[PDB]
């Protein structure tokens, strides 16, 4: 038994349930840092229940809201924007990323001052959104999958409406033509390198197909 096994065996049921659901509404947060403030999180900051830190042994500012008390199943999104526009992109998305209605409890953004300009996580993939199965038995529910898909589509729309220029999608990730910023990989069944073979495998991931079709 596994998260992905449940997705395979309920593939059409989940998809059909999702397409019948009304549009998700996300109350956007206002009492949030801008990108500069985000970089100043240090040891501890908090905005809208998301604990913030920028003091780890890595180049990211991490955001974590307490999860409902399934286990991480590898499913995650990157957001790629033009390197120069990360601060504006972050601000535009902050209402959604810190929303009390967001299905994403754990995410991270590159600290652009900690990386060389031409770095993988500088030219693109400046955000990572980590998805966890919402049910106690580590299964995804249709309600949550719908919410998650609606959420990333809201992120797409906000960036597009703000005229944010797209970034350089990492070689590791896949995305459909209608995702100009968002991309996907599964951490359990793919690597950071990528390649056509890996990208081909990722396109078959039930989770990815449920997000796109």
């Amino acid at each position: 038994p596994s998260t992905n096994k449940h997705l395979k065996n309920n593939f059409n049921s989940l998809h059909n349930q999702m397409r019948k659901m009304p549009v998700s509404h996300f109350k956007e947060a206002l009492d949030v840092p801008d990108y500069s403030g985000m970089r100043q999180s240090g040891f501890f900051a908090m905005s809208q229940g998301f604990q913030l830190n920028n003091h780890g042994y890595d180049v990211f500012i991490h955001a974590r809201r307490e999860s409902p008390q399934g286990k991480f199943a590898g499913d995650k999104f990157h957001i790629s924007v033009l390197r120069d526009m990360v601060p504006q992109a972050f601000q535009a998305l902050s209402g959604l990323l810190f929303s009390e209605d967001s299905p994403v409890d754990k995410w991270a953004v590159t600290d652009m001052e900690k990386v060389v300009q031409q770095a993988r996580v500088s030219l693109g993939a400046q955000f990572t959104l980590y998805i966890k199965p919402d049910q106690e038995n580590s299964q995804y529910s249709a309600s949550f999958l719908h919410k998650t898909r609606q959420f990333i589509e809201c992120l797409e729309s906000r960036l597009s409406e703000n005229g944010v220029i797209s970034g350089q999608c990492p070689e590791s990730d896949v995305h459909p033509e209608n995702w100009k910023y968002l991309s996907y990989r599964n951490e359990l069944r793919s690597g950071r390198d990528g390649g056509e073979m890996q990208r081909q495998a990722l396109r078959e991931e039930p989770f990815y197909r449920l997000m796109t079709e």
Binding site: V59, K76, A119, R120, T128, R192
Partner: peptide, 9 residues
Amino acid sequence: QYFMTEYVA
């Protein structure tokens, strides 16, 4: 070491 977008617990 510093550049991984890996989920850390």
